Nucleic acid binder design. Structure first.
Ligand code: MG
Ligand code: MG
Ligand code: MG
Ligand code: MG
Ligand code: MG
Ligand code: MG
Ligand code: MG
Length: 41
RNA sequence: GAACUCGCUGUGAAGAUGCAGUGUACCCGCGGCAAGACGGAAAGACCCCGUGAACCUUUACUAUAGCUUGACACUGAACAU
């Protein structure tokens, strides 16, 4: 899955970029706590 | 099935009231007995057959519920080997 980040998650990514992350990771953690949004543009 | 429904000996799907020979016997009831009518009942239960049935068994065949194994999915993160 592709996510547009909204924060600096000290694991892997910085703000405002599209990054390939596990679908479950994005669905359960990133999206539900801000941090990221899906890459729909 | 219909009967004007005797005994014997034989013959005969091979154990005869009914065929042959022969003996006996007037016609008809009533009370009894139960030897025969292969008496009545039940399309033999025993036996065999049917490429018949049913239930039952098992290390008969084929499956399958269940139990169980792993892959993939729901399912992600960090790190160390
Ligand atoms: Mg005789
Ligand atoms: Mg006689
Ligand atoms: Mg009498
Ligand atoms: Mg009798
Ligand atoms: Mg009597
Ligand atoms: Mg009889
Ligand atoms: Mg019969």
């Amino acid at each position: 899955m592709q996510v547009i980040l909204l924060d600096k998650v000290a694991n892997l990514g910085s703000l405002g970029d599209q990054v390939n992350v596990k679908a479950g990771y994005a669905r359960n953690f990133l999206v539900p706590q801000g941090k990221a949004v899906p890459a729909t543009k």
